[PDB]
Structure 1
Amino acid sequence: GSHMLREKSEKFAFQAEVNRMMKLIINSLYKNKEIFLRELISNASDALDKIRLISLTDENALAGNEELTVKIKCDKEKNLLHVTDTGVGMTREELVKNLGTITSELIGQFGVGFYSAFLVADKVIVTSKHNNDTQHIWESDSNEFSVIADPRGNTLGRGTTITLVLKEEASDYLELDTIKNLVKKYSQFINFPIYVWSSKTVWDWELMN
């Protein structure tokens, strides 16, 4: 089973238009970086709408995970921010196509906000499980991207986790108070329940909307 690593078939280049779009998004939102969270939450909401629709006509749609939620975790020690939804997920092919091929209001309207994650992160990782495929991991530092089968197996059930390796200067997004304030603000009109893993010292999910 060494064919894939030896041939490097897990490696991909972004489409030129995507490189151009990433630069446009990043340069224009430089003074309003916090918008990245609003966009990841919006994308999660869209994914939840999709599986909700599919569940109307597909009786086994929610079998891999019965809930419809967005859950956010701050891992200060590991310098990571996780945004996990139990939406429709993406197959390995969708990770390649949907993320690798193709002003705050416009960005949100055309739904290309995913790329704004690079305003606060040196690396963006997307772990996803779709009913029609096994769990896969997409990763990128914006200069290329790779997609590999998740060696951890099916841990998500169904859904997607966006993991951000935050830039040194973006450490404030690991602060619970900062994240609750933003998540509360950006989840206000989202129809699905959004939670933030927080302490009260005991930890548990805190409903934000």
Structure 2
Amino acid sequence: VETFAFQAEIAQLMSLIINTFYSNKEIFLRELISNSSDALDKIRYESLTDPSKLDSGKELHINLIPNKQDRTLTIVDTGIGMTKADLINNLGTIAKSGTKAFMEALQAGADISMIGQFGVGFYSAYLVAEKVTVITKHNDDEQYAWESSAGGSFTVRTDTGEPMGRGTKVILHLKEDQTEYLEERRIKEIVKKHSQFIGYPITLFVE
């Protein structure tokens, strides 16, 4: 298990998300589904010239898996997946510059819901999650698990869990007061409101 420090700017972003009074937390799901869509677009694009890229899984989709016993909401996609380097480099984002822009926008009157416009939507997960685990598999790398409960550090390890063919799984370990996001009707509402034009099947698992 390797432990890394967040860049100061990203730690600042995370504290802002965790500490700011802001009621419209539901947008985290839109942001994660958008990320999944982007990753699915990437593997589809690659497959247009090299169909063997889909040998690790032909179906391009997004699954939403609530588990009330574990208090987790898991978002699974069969997108391109991230390499170990992607994970370490802020989950494939340019988060330092994105955070700078986001901060400046907030000071000018923007609100947290606009986070995705700055390319750092992943971190909105911390609106509702006390811990986030990201399991990922790219065609050109091994399966890795990234994890952070904020507090300035994240870990990366090779994943010995259930193998995924290809793609990314974001496991949200929800805060005690945010269990509404495990309820079918609430999740359905959010998907319908914010993700109407995502061009991949979004399947909400039931329990």
Task: Specify if TM > 0.5.
Answer: yes
Question: Given the alignment of the two structures, is residue 14 of structure 1 paired with residue 6 of structure 2, yes or no?
Answer: yes
* 1:109 pairs with one of 105, 108, 117: 117
Q: Which runs of 5+ in 2 are unaligned?
A: 97-110
Q: CA deviation at 1:26?
A: 4.1
Answer 1 or 2: higher relative contact order, Cα 8 Å, separation at least 6.
Answer: 2
How far apart in 2 are the matches of 1:107 and 1:29? 15
* 1:130 pairs with one of 131, 135, 138: 138
Pairs aligned (count):
190
Q: CA deviation at 1:62?
A: 0.9
Question: Given the alignment of the two structures, is residue 166 of structure 1 paired with residue 174 of structure 2, yes or no?
Answer: yes
How far apart in 1 are the matches of 2:31 and 2:19? 16
SS for the counterpart of 2:48 is helix
CA gap 1:174/1:105 in 2 versus in 1, 3 angstroms: closer
Q: CA deviation at 1:91?
A: 1.0
Residue 27 of structure 2 contacts residue 113 of structure 2 at CA under 8 Å; is this kept in 1? no
Residue 187 of structure 1 contacts residue 194 of structure 1 at CA under 8 Å; is this kept in 2? no
Between stretches 56-65 and 37-46, larger displacement belongs to 56-65
Q: CA deviation at 1:185?
A: 2.1
How far apart in 2 are the matches of 1:121 and 1:198? 20
The residue type paired with residue 125 of structure 1 is: T
* 1:83 pairs with one of 63, 75, 85: 75
How far apart in 1 are the matches of 2:147 and 2:22? 22
Q: Which runs of 5+ in 1 are unaligned?
A: 200-209
How far apart in 2 are the matches of 1:29 and 1:131? 40
**What is the TM-score of this pair, normalised by structure 2?**
0.86
* 1:145 pairs with one of 133, 143, 154: 154
How far apart in 2 are the matches of 1:105 and 1:198? 28
The residue type paired with residue 42 of structure 1 is: S
- List structure 1 segments (4+ residues) > 6 angstroms apart after TM superposition: none
User: What's 1:70 paired with?
Assistant: 62
SS for the counterpart of 1:49 is helix
How far apart in 2 are the matches of 1:114 and 1:38? 10
Residue 81 of structure 2 contacts residue 168 of structure 2 at CA under 8 Å; is this kept in 1? yes
Between stretches 121-130 and 90-99, larger displacement belongs to 90-99
After superposition, what is the alpha-carbon deviation per residue over 1:4-54, rounded to whole angstroms, capped at 9, x for unaligned? x5xxxx111100111122233445572111110010001001101111111
User: What's 2:103 paired with?
Assistant: none
User: What's 1:176 paired with?
Assistant: 184
How far apart in 1 are the matches of 2:46 and 2:88? 22
After superposition, what is the alpha-carbon deviation per residue over 1:73-97, rounded to whole angstroms, capped at 9, x for unaligned? 0000111100001000001111111
How far apart in 1 are the matches of 2:28 and 2:68? 18
